[model samples]
Target: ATSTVKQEITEGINRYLYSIDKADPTLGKQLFYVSPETSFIHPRGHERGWSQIAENFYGTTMGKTFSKRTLKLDAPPAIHVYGNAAVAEFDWHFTAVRRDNGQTQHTTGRESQVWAKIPNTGWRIVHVHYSGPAKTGVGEGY
Candidate 1:
């Protein structure tokens, strides 16, 4: 039972990441429907609400050039489901390449997501906290 739940949650996260890579904020918005009160925090700021999250993605320079490759997820991902709510934690690594200059940025991060199983939305994010290596400029970091 636990293993199946874990797989479902992990697949949800993968779908969310794929949505982001596709620049489909609409699909990305669905992630929050599973957890309507979801919070997304970043270096720039923190956002609450699916609408805000969609706007945040649409309002970034990174949004314009956002493309990811080869997402790797660490195993033994933790997933806890209680009633209609769930929490998942995992480590992910991916490379984001800029569309304009063709600069490749590698990012590794830990993410925790709070989800609610909505009647129609399945599992949607209600809270999300992601922290990762800082962005480095070209030739800036070794």
Candidate 2:
């Protein structure tokens, strides 16, 4: 049962990231259950609720103009599900080009996400932690 739950959660996250990479906030928003209780935290700061998430991205330069070209996971994603609560952790490598400057940014990072199952909705991200190198690492093919 846990395996199945993990698979479902993993698929949901993949779809969420896909929406984000495409700059489709509308779709990305659906990934979340949408609640004032939700929390999202990055290296920059923490945001509460789905509206805050949308606002944070919609207001940022990168969020407005950045689109991921490719998202590669370094290792198999780890998913833990206990009843209606779950967490997922994975290492991700992102290759994206800024729409404004066409400059590419290759980023590698680890992300841990907390998700909860809404009453009628599926798993939604309630908290997130993303960390990466300050500068692009070496051996980047550009």
lDDT (tens digit, per residue) of candidate 2 on 1-142: 7887888888888886776666566786788767787777776677777777777853352366675466667877898887999989998888878878889988788888888887787778888778774456696534
How far in Å is the alpha carbon of 127 misplaced in model 1? Answer: 1.2
Cα lDDT tens digits for candidate 1, 1-142: 6566667787888888777666677777766672346578764678776767777753452466565445567664688888778888888886778767788988787878887777865767787777775558997636
Worst 10 residues of 2 by lDDT: 57-66
What is the RMSD of candidate 2?
Answer: 5.0
Candidate 2 overall lDDT versus native: 0.75
Give residue 30's lDDT in candidate 2 (0 to 100): 81
